[PDB]
């Protein structure tokens, strides 16, 4: 399930730090240690950590096939191998510069690339852990125009016959508050196929709740995944943590 | 093993619909075995016991059915193992060489349970059937009942993972932590509350099994 993993979302846009520092110092604080993060959605991943080495494992992702390059990124010392698998996405189509990275604790037996219907939108790149899927997105900064189409394409793709059993969870910088995204998915989306997950307080020094995630309702125990906001990091907007509601 | 079992109070539909979810994110295994991260202590365990022996499920149910406060029913949820179902012995043997320590009370417990901890949440795709365990008070037996078999049970050709639980955090050199256990010295991680029950709709009242320390009851039955 989704609550099964400590899923988190974050964007590297900082406007005041280095392009690769937050990868080494900030993201590590979220991932290192079992009390860290399981799956971290890193938007604006201009480049993966230099300390990571590509694994060369070819990927034939579902949906739209774009080059997805997986890296091995040790986090701990050379003795205790805290191996992390960074699923990056840089160059796909004329709408180049995806810069979406999904670093996870375990390697993903499947990777999904769900290009929304819009032409200038970013492809929804996600990983697959057994019967669990964790997608991320990065809508346009002009008000999340494809934000709706970003979540819809994900739904449409995971209502397929073979992709139905999966419990997917899209989370990224939608650039559109939940009340605005939930507005684009209400006129006809009347089954509540997805339950938007966003924190209470804003998620940007100047913005609102642009950073959040969305979990399919029909997926098991989707109601447990509560979207909390990680304390301020070096980026421009907070990282959104998707933990499980206590029991 | 091939099919691990778990006793729960949620009706079969609830599990076949939602399945079994973890209690939290705490990956500290030394805490799980001792029941500290399960319904006993912090209640944030990132595993699910899922004993392999059907006898343990009867013991689990007998532990519950044999209380003057438990009213609801209890059916066994036969759960198919997969690449994410991990036993203890491979996980303990690794946590030992890594500097950890599992005092003989934990080893004593772990040997009786035959646990197969599910690092991931047990999805309905794995739960095969739910055997509604009936209890004859006059005899104290735990007999089977209507075995409502799951509908969407994906009968994959998978078995338990004999490897080591991945992402096991650094262990504690010496814990002396209260080993919570209920009924006939069953690990606390088998209780109904050992898995989150935040299911859609009004959460049916789950029994709050009062656990006990397994360390003494163990040390009492060994010596003398």
């Amino acid at each position: 399930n989704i609550s099964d993993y400590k899923v988190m979302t974050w964007n590297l846009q900082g406007s005041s730090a280095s392009t690769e520092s937050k990868w080494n110092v900030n993201v590590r604080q979220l991932l290192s240690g079992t009390a860290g993060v399981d799956i971290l959605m890193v938007q604006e991943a201009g480049a993966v950590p230099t300390s990571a080495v590509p694994t060369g494992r070819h990927i034939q992702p579902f949906g739209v096939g774009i080059p997805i390059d997986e890296y091995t990124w040790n986090l701990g010392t050379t003795s205790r191998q805290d191996i992390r698998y960074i699923y990056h996405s840089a160059i796909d189509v004329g709408a180049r510069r995806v810069n979406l990275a999904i670093v996870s604790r375990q390697r993903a037996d499947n990777v999904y690339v769900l290009r929304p219907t819009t032409v200038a939108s970013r492809p929804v790149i996600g990983i697959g852990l057994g019967n669990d899927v964790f997608l991320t997105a990065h809508a346009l900064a002009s008000g999340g125009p494809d934000a709706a189409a970003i979540v819809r394409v994900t739904i449409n793709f995971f209502r397929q016959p073979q992709m139905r059993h999966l419990s997917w969870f899209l989370a990224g910088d939608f650039n559109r508050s939940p009340d605005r995204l939930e507005n684009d998915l209400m006129t006809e989306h009347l089954e509540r196929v997805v339950a938007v997950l966003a924190p209470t307080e804003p998620t940007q020094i100047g913005g609102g709740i642009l950073d959040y995630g969305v979990i399919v309702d029909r997926a098991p125990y989707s109601q447990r995944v509560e979207a909390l906001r990680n304390p301020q990091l070096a980026s421009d907007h907070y990282p959104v943590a998707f933990l499980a509601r206590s029991c | 093993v091939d099919f691990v079992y778990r006793v729960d109070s949620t009706p079969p539909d609830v599990i076949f619909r939602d399945g079994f979810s973890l209690l939290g994110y705490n990956r500290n295994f030394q805490q799980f075995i001792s029941g500290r991260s399960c319904s006993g202590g912090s209640s944030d365990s990132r595993y699910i016991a899922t004993t392999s022996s059907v006898n343990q499920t009867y013991a689990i149910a007998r532990a519950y059915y044999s209380r003057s406060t438990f009213k609801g029913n209890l059916y066994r949820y036969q759960i198919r193992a997969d690449n994410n179902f991990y036993s203890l012995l491979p996980s303990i043997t690794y946590l030992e060489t890594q500097g950890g320590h599992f005092n003989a009370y934990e080893k004593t417990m772990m040997r009786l349970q035959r646990e197969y901890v599910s690092t991931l949440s047990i999805l309905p795709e794995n739960i095969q059937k739910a055997v509604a365990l009936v209890y004859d008070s006059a005899t104290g037996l735990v007999k089977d009942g209507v075995s409502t078999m799951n509908a969407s049970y994906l009968g994959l050709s998978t078995t338990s993972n004999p490897g080591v639980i991945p992402f096991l955090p650094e262990p504690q050199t010496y814990t002396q932590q209260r080993i919570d256990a209920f009924g006939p010295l069953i690990s606390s991680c088998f209780s109904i509350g050992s898995v989150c029950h935040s299911h859609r709709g009004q959460r049916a009242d789950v029994y709050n099994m009062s656990f006990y320390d397994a360390r003494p009851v163990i040390e009492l039955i060994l010596s003398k």
Partner: antibody, heavy 118, light 106 residues
Framework: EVQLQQSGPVLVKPGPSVKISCKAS????????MNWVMQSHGKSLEWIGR????????FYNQKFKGKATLTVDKSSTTAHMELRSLASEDSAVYYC????????????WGQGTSVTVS | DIQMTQSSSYLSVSQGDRVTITCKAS??????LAWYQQKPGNAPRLLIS???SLKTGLPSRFSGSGSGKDFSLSITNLQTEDVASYYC?????????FGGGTKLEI
């Protein structure tokens, strides 16, 4: 408002190829799956196929293949249903409806395109 | 193709009657079904989608229920406008199929 302006009724020759346009107006046509349902003058509904306008993906009912080839044009937001071998049994009203999500109900339908052979 | 059927082809029910129309499927389509209302001349109007989600902006008198291979569209207080054909259509598999059509009556 979201509506599906269908084409007018069409009477066909014995077994020609007929086209049933479905003008999708009021929403992002390139975002949803356009379906196609035929209902005899007194019988129930029978969904023919679907068309994903963004990628042109198509899924038929495995029995209208030889008598229906779905196709759309992102420009003008119209879905064309080229039906072949318009036998007397094909005399019915063909509805087009936008599917909200892949494998989901069809929120908005068309007024109908009564096709008849003679 | 997972066909579907409606045991009641003409659910004769007068005004204000609790008109529940059955629907049986050939495979588990839990929470995945659509109920379309179709007047004699009008086009099929989606009433319920999924398990029981009533279409936004529709009368609350309607009500869906069921899962697996059985379903039931409950109509508490019938109405002349509501006296029309109804079709239960699964979308769990790519070959879609509609109910037999329970054309209402009085």
């Amino acid at each position: 408002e979201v509506q599906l302006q269908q084409s007018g009724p069409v009477l066909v020759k014995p077994g020609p190829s007929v086209k049933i346009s479905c003008k999708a107006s009021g929403y992002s046509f390139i975002d949803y799956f356009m379906n196609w349902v035929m209902q005899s003058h007194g019988k129930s509904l029978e969904w023919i196929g679907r068309i994903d306008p963004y990628s042109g993906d198509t899924f038929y009912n495995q029995k209208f293949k030889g008598k229906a080839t779905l196709t759309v044009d992102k420009s003008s937001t119209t879905a064309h249903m080229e039906l072949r071998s318009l036998a007397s049994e094909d005399s019915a009203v063909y509805y087009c409806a936008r599917e909200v999500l892949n494998y989901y109900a069809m929120d908005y339908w068309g007024q109908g395109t009564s096709v008849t052979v003679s | 193709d997972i066909q579907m059927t409606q045991s009641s082809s003409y659910l004769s029910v007068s005004q204000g009657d609790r008109v529940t129309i059955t629907c049986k499927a050939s495979d588990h389509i839990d929470n995945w079904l659509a109920w379309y209302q179709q007047k004699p001349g009008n086009a099929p109007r989606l009433l319920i989608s999924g398990a029981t989600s009533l279409k936004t902006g529709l009368p609350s008198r309607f009500s869906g229920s069921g899962s697996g291979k059985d379903f039931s569209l409950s109509i508490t207080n019938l109405q002349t406008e509501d006296v029309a054909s109804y079709y239960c259509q699964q979308y769990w598999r790519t070959p879609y199929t509609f109910g037999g059509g329970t054309k209402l009556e009085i």
